[PDB]
Design a protein around this ligand. Structure first.
Ligand code: GTP
Ligand code: PHE
Ligand code: FME
Ligand code: MG
Ligand code: MG
Ligand code: MG
Ligand code: MG
Ligand code: MG
Ligand code: MG
Ligand code: MG
Ligand code: MG
Ligand code: MG
Ligand code: MG
Ligand code: MG
Ligand code: MG
Ligand code: MG
Ligand code: MG
Ligand code: MG
Ligand code: MG
Ligand code: MG
Ligand code: MG
Ligand code: MG
Ligand code: MG
Ligand code: MG
Ligand code: MG
Ligand code: MG
Length: 393
RNA sequence: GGUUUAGAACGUCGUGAGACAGUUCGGUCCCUAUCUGCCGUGGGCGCUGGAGAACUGAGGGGGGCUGCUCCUAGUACGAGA
């Protein structure tokens, strides 16, 4: 919090997706040291991407860490996802703000169950674009074996409804690029080119009023409570009235500084991850799931009608009927919440793979409007996508 | 230290002397090694003329224990941990 962030080069939210222990987090560490050395940005290291006791004694990542690497054309902002089966909830917050992912499948193991589960969550939430990266390569010195894995990833993406064959598959070791190998340094410089070429300039909404979902709350020693997250729409000026709506109730507030990776800002525009500092709020009372809206724009609701599209076995979901009293998890912008289902009259049962409308009473109120997209999940897997129809409360 | 002598007391049994795998406090542990054995250390003669060395090695005898940490490799094995 000292240097002013100059608004030059378009902002893009990138992040690594893939299987457990697959060079997902190590790729992010390779991207920093490669781009910092040649172009001449800020250095950083692989340690700062994941410290704590939880990501050292174990080794695995839980928290969605963030990184800022700059290139001549654009200014990227990384989101390193966790990857494991237990950490799907805090991943979806990292994956929702991500515009164009970098998928991570490896040349020794290949596509494994989580890779299918990750890309499934990317479609229903919001992941337009995706780039493959083979994160081992050197361990198996062979031309025939390494290229057989490329075929199966093209099959996976195309089977699940992505381009597949059009996606630029890249090969390169992360640990070799970390030290200083001229061939492998240049091969991950090539990935920075593939991010620039394939992913276009993202479409933001800097017109309709301010909204910002809170991904992770902080308490800065000196300033007060800081909320992070991508600004979904509108803008944020310093010393402007902001209403925090969602779980519990609703509180008034005012912004006292917006920032971009420990650098000051005047206007926090849409489509970019920013840390908003709120005035006169405690760490405990403000929680994860609430949204920073402009006063009057949005209202918290505990009941709503919604056109729910339930999935079948082929698309990946439930395979049995259910009656009123069923309680699955509804993932709106960031957080999840449980809610009882009340079906319409003249509908005895809800079969899998069917379009119907239904009233859903949530246990916690969340800020919502008509035409909001969500993805229902239960039992460590997906259930059904849909849209909000009418407000009731 | 315990149990097992003489003192004393408690509970208990006995009219009592006393008694109790009931308890409680106090209460002499000798031996200079002949033989066998064993550990060492010599004298004597023998080994075929004597003497000084150096050995071979039949046959004994000691010795023989394991831990972590790193590397292999977060590799194989596992959705994962
Ligand atoms: N040979 C090789 N090993 C790698 C590479 N990248 C990572 N590793 C190994 O895997 C670990 C790196 O963590 P990754 O699993 O790649 O990334 P991650 O985000 O921690 O993975 P998740 O647990 O899924 O979050 C290190 O301990 C490395 O030993 C690579 O490019 N080549
Ligand atoms: N926009 C934030 C992203 C972030 C969130 C949480 C921790 C670190 C970084 C910067 O800084
Ligand atoms: C003078 S009481 C003696 C007790 C006896 N001692 C040795 O045999 C026991 O047995
Ligand atoms: Mg990860
Ligand atoms: Mg006060
Ligand atoms: Mg005694
Ligand atoms: Mg005694
Ligand atoms: Mg007596
Ligand atoms: Mg007796
Ligand atoms: Mg007795
Ligand atoms: Mg005693
Ligand atoms: Mg005495
Ligand atoms: Mg004595
Ligand atoms: Mg004698
Ligand atoms: Mg003797
Ligand atoms: Mg002897
Ligand atoms: Mg003789
Ligand atoms: Mg002789
Ligand atoms: Mg002879
Ligand atoms: Mg011998
Ligand atoms: Mg003999
Ligand atoms: Mg022996
Ligand atoms: Mg040993
Ligand atoms: Mg190691
Ligand atoms: Mg190891
Ligand atoms: Mg591991």
């Amino acid at each position: 919090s000292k240097e002013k962030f100059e608004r030059t080069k378009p902002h893009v939210n990138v992040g690594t997706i893939g299987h457990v222990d697959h060079g997902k987090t190590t790729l992010t560490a390779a991207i920093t040291t490669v781009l910092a050395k040649t172009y001449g940005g800020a250095a950083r290291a692989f340690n700062q991407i994941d410290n704590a006791p939880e990501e050292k004694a174990r080794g695995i990542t839980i928290n969605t860490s963030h990184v800022e690497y700059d290139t001549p054309t654009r200014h990227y902002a990384h989101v390193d996802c966790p990857g494991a089966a237990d950490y799907v909830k805090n991943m979806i917050t990292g994956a929702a703000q991500m515009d164009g992912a970098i998928l991570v499948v490896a040349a020794t193991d290949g596509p494994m169950p989580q890779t299918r589960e990750h890309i499934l969550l990317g479609r229903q939430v919001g992941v337009p674009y995706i780039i493959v990266f083979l994160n081992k390569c050197d361990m198996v010195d062979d031309e025939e074996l390494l290229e057989l894995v490329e075929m199966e990833v093209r099959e996976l993406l195309s089977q699940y409804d992505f381009p597949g064959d059009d996606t630029p598959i890249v090969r390169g070791s992360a640990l070799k690029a970390l030290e200083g190998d001229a061939e492998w340094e240049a091969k991950i410089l090539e990935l920075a080119g593939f991010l620039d070429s394939y992913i276009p300039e993202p479409e933001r909404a800097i017109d309709k009023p301010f909204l910002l979902p809170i991904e992770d709350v902080f308490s800065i020693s000196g300033r007060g409570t800081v909320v992070t997250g991508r600004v979904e729409r509108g803008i944020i000026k310093v010393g402007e009235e902001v209403e925090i709506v969602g779980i519990k109730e609703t509180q008034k507030s005012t912004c006292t500084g917006v920032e971009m990776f420990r650098k000051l800002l005047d206007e926090g525009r849409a489509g970019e991850n920013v840390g908003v500092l709120l005035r006169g709020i405690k760490r405990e009372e403000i929680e994860r799931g609430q949204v920073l809206a402009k006063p009057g724009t949005i209202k918290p609701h505990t009941k709503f009608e919604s056109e729910v599209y339930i999935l079948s076995k082929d698309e990946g979901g439930r395979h049995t009927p259910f009656f009123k009293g069923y309680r699955p998890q509804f993932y709106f912008r960031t957080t999840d919440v449980t809610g009882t289902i009340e079906l319409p009259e003249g509908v005895e049962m809800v079969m899998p793979g069917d379009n119907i409308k239904m009233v859903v009473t949530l246990i916690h109120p969340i800020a919502m409007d008509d035409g909001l997209r969500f993805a229902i999940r239960e039992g460590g897997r997906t259930v059904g996508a849909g849209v909000v129809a009418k407000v009731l409360s």
